[PDB]
Design a protein around this nucleic acid. Structure first.
Ligand code: TTP
Ligand code: CA
Ligand code: CA
Ligand code: CA
Ligand code: CA
Ligand code: CA
Length: 895
DNA sequence: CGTAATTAATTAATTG
DNA sequence: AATTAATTAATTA
């Protein structure tokens, strides 16, 4: 097998590399890498190195990395461009791995761990690490074992050994319910004192040094805590042994009185799973406790205990250790499902960056582009300083607020990267400019044809057609990868719905789930077999389909983010190929494409239909159009339909056979009009939406831009077994909306679109009757807590203090002089509740850290002073008022 | 050190 | 309540 790197670092004039060799064995080497950079040279100098603009460059080979770096500084001061990859580890990696990397994950040491620290005086700050580490569980991917380091004796208590027997038993049975599938994988090690525990953990770490270090919050708690505790007890050089090169860097953050740190461990790539989850999951969560995320992703129960966590070891060491192990295993479970580590390795190795650089689209693209250009013996430009400037983006149509009964939407395939490729937008493909007519004139095809020679964008930019830009070239490759995974995801999704259909009529038999790969559409033979399966076999198959869909979702949506990020990167001053003309070309072409196709669809739909000048396109946003289908249904006649699936079939056929071909012809004209390099504006039907046939449901509605709801029966080829609500922007979608309110408003929308006005009125009353009985957490608002210090005036709200900060300031006054009540962390999320006037908290609202029961000392008071009336009006009634007024409905029977 | 467009909620001040 | 502006948070794309 071909070699691949694990980690790369620059220490002085040396590159330190851990790698897998041709026999699949982990190795380390130190290389005195001699880098190269380039300067522009007179034409009269024969060479093989040119910049992206085809200007001649001469290579300077340096004795070592410091002198290359020194050369750059020198070139800045003179004002002469120093060209080349100035990040030397990428340059090194590009030389040492002169090929598409094929990697083997089973050889990569992936490690997650977490630690427990008992603290009788509040949060144990990693920067002081003054309390003993009393448990560590460290899972090693290569061994596939959980190494459990348990402290038996501590200042805060001497405890008995942990029983794997009791651990294994379910909680019903008085056990700890450690999943049976990992029981046999636990290697348990108790210790007499903290010193040998830590010493043994160090040697262990030396034997089994992580390449990928992960876990939950490990970068901000576990890593810095372990590092500092070992430092205090043993000394810094001993703590440096966590780096396989005995080098670390401590980053210090703020913070008036507060101080937290982040350790960089040279020779390891840290991918904190919270950070992976925030970047790659495409959710926004009310809370980021592992308990909250585990429940969300895996549907597992919260890790319940009695007393505060600072007394859990003391009172129930057994559960203390079991919960430590499970916590570690839950992250593993989440990744088994989400597959983010895998995604990181894929992207990292494709780009030839340090794996931890996947968090950075700019860094990622810089390497991809560098490698792509290096292969052709071309030289990359030097990074330049730019001022930050606002620039124009997408077009959003103003909709008429209303109910819309039948709606078909259409959306463009991967729009921005498609524009990049169609127009040939790249730093080196710029050809010139033309005189700019109003966008409106290009939309209406009345403006003069910009160029007969070059590929054009309505912002005035012209690009060469006769060669390919590095940006179109490299975005195309990732796009194709994205396309493949999306294919796998949609088939998995379609397969899911087939299984869902089959669950309506489950057969009474004893059978097994079928052995199938879900990334592929079921064969007819398979579909026949599915119709004779039992619910048990069907339900298990469904779970597997859904799991396959999720993996395909991860793979496709993150590749989409990467490619869409290149379009954005053109507008970030830190990107080497930053150019606002190129960013503008993309967005302005986009604005044209959408409005252009709006005109074309209306024109078409007026011809068929036999109408004159009706606006069929009700709404659009960036790359999408929403088409009122009422008149399409009208022509054939609503009474002509047997059931819902009949008119859904009808519209589906009409879009596929009539609309898409008319749209394609429309965009081919535009491409010719802009003289583009390649036609790639592909717009296909997305949603078919409407009320169930024969019902009083309204089907859908808009309140304004970026705010609507649709009852969808078919989504880009997936025919649902049950209609799904497509709700965008509305409070049902916002993480700041109370949990119970999100559900109530969703059922409200469901009744409106599927059942009608009378049904809505029934639910409203029922919810209102039950509101005061719901759990206070489920009805609390949520918000991020930024700038708490800015508005804190002696514990009281300063000028312009936001409601949610006011709440935090009310919290902080309530918990003064109290050690074991949890503190609100700057930047984190908080639950928020209104308080009735005359409350003893002295203010109108209170806030406490999200994902946690409010501390017992004031829970009783908060529950009693909650303003349910304000709460209901603010979070539930006001949003519904907006939905219903837009849809011309009443939530209460009007007098 | 991917982007812009857009909403809703809330504070301050003003609307004779 | 009802604006206009400014800030903050959170979406859609
Ligand atoms: C989601 C997203 C979209 N956009 C812009 C660029 C997209 O091409 C355009 C349309 O967004 P989308 O339609 O959401 O995505 P897409 O067209 O790029 O990909 P798909 O094939 O699944 O439809 O909006 C961003 O700039 N950043 C983003 O994060
Ligand atoms: Ca814990
Ligand atoms: Ca799209
Ligand atoms: Ca059946
Ligand atoms: Ca879209
Ligand atoms: Ca599509």
């Amino acid at each position: 097998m071909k070699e691949f790197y694990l980690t790369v670092e620059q220490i002085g004039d040396s590159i330190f590399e851990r790698y897998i060799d041709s026999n699949g064995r982990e190795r380390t080497r130190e290389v005195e890498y001699k880098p190269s950079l380039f300067a522009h040279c007179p034409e009269s100098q024969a060479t093989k190195y040119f910049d992206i603009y085809g200007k001649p460059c001469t290579r300077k080979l340096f004795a070592n990395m410091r002198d290359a770096s020194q050369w750059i500084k020198r070139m800045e001061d003179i004002g002469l461009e120093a060209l080349g990859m100035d990040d030397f580890k990428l340059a090194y990696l590009s030389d040492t791995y002169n090929y598409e990397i094929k990697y083997d994950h089973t050889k990569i040491r992936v490690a997650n761990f977490d630690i427990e620290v008992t603290s009788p005086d509040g949060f144990p700050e990693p920067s002081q690490a003054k309390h003993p580490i009393d448990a560590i569980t460290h899972y090693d991917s290569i061994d596939d074992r959980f190494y459990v380091f348990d402290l038996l004796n501590s200042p805060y208590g001497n405890v008995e050994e942990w029983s794997i027997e009791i651990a294994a038993k379910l909680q019903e049975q008085g056990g700890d319910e450690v999943p049976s599938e990992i029981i046999d994988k636990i290697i348990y090690m108790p210790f007499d004192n903290e010193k040998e525990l830590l010493m043994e953990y160090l040697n262990f770490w030396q034997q089994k040094t992580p390449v990928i270090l992960t876990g939950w919050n490990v970068e901000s708690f576990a890593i810095p805590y372990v590092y500092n505790r070992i430092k205090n007890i043993f000394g810094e050089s001993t703590a440096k042994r966590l780096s396989p090169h005995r080098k670390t860097r401590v980053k210090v953050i703020e913070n008036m009185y507060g101080s937290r740190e982040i350790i960089t461990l040279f020779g390891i790539s840290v991918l904190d799973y919270i950070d992976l989850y925030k970047k790659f999951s495409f959710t926004n969560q009310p809370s980021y406790s592992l308990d909250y995320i585990s429940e969300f992703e895996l549907n597992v129960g919260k890790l319940k205990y009695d007393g505060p966590i600072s007394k859990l070891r003391e009172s129930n060491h057994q559960r203390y250790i079991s919960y430590n192990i499970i916590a570690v295993y839950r992250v593993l479970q989440i990744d088994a499902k989400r597959q983010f580590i895998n995604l990181s390795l894929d992207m990292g190795y494709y780009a030839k960056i340090q794996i931890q650089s996947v968090f950075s689209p700019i860094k990622t693209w810089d390497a991809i582009i560098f490698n792509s250009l290096k292969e052709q013996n071309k030289v990359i430009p030097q990074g330049r300083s730019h001022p930050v400037q606002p620039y124009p983006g997408a077009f959003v149509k103003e909709p008429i607020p209303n109910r819309y009964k039948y709606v078909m939407s259409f959306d463009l395939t991967s729009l921005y990267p498609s524009i990049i490729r169609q127009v040939n937008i790249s730093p080196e493909t710029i050809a010139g400019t033309f005189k700019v007519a109003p966008l409106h004139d290009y939309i209406n095809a009345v403006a003069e044809r910009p160029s007969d020679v070059y590929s054009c964008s309505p912002n005035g930019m012209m690009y060469y057609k006769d060669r390919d830009g590095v940006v179109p070239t490299e975005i195309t490759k990732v796009f194709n990868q994205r396309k493949e995974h999306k294919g796998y995801m949609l088939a998995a999704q379609r397969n899911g719905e087939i299984i869902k259909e089959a669950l309506h009529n489950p057969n009474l038999s004893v059978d097994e789930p079928l052995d199938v790969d879900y990334r592929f559409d079921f064969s007819d033979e398979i579909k026949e077999k599915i119709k004779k399966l039992s619910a048990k076999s069907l339900n298990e198959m469904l779970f597997r389909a859904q799991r396959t869909e999720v993996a395909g979702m991860t793979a496709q949506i993150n590749r989409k983010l990467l490619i869409n990020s290149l379009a954005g990167a053109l507008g970030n001053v830190w990107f080497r190929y930053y150019d606002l003309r190129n960013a503008t070309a993309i967005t302005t072409f986009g604005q044209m494409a959408l409005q252009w196709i709006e005109r074309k669809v209306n024109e078409y739909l007026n011809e068929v239909c036999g109408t004159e000048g009706e606006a069929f396109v009700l709404y659009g946003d960036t790359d999408s159009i929403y088409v009122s289908a009422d008149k399409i249904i009208d022509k054939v006649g609503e009474s002509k339909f047997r059931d819902t699936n009949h008119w859904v079939d009808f519209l589906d056929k009409f879009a596929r056979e009539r609309m898409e071909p008319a749209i394609d012809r429309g965009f081919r004209e535009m491409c010719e009009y802009m003289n583009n390099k390649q036609h790639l504006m592909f717009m296909d039907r997305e949603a078919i939406a409407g009320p169930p046939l024969g019902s009083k449901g309204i089907g859908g509605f808009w309140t304004g831009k970026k705010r609507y709801a649709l009852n969808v029966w078919d989504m880009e080829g997936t025919r649902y077994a049950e209609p799904k609500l497509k709700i965008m922007g509305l409070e049902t979608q916002k993480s700041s909306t109370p949990k119970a309110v999100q559900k109530a408003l969703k059922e409200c929308i469901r009744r409106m679109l599927q059942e009608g006005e009378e049904s809505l009125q029934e639910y409203f009353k029922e919810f209102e009757k039950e509101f005061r009985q719901l759990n206070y957490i489920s009805i609390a608002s949520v918000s991020s807590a930024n700038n708490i210090a800015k508005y804190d005036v002696g514990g009281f709200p300063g000028p312009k203090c936001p409601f949610h900060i006011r709440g935090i300031l009310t919290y902080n006054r309530a918990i003064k002089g109290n050690i074991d009540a949890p503190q609100v962390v700057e930047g984190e999320k908080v639950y928020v509740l209104p308080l009735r006037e005359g409350n003893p908290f002295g203010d109108k609202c209170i806030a406490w850290p999200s994902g946690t029961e409010i501390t017992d000392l004031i829970k009783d008071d908060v529950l009693h002073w909650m303003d349910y009336t304000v709460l209901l009006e603010k979070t539930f009634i006001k949003p519904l008022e907006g939905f219903t007024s837009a849809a011309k409905l009443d939530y209460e029977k009007k007098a």
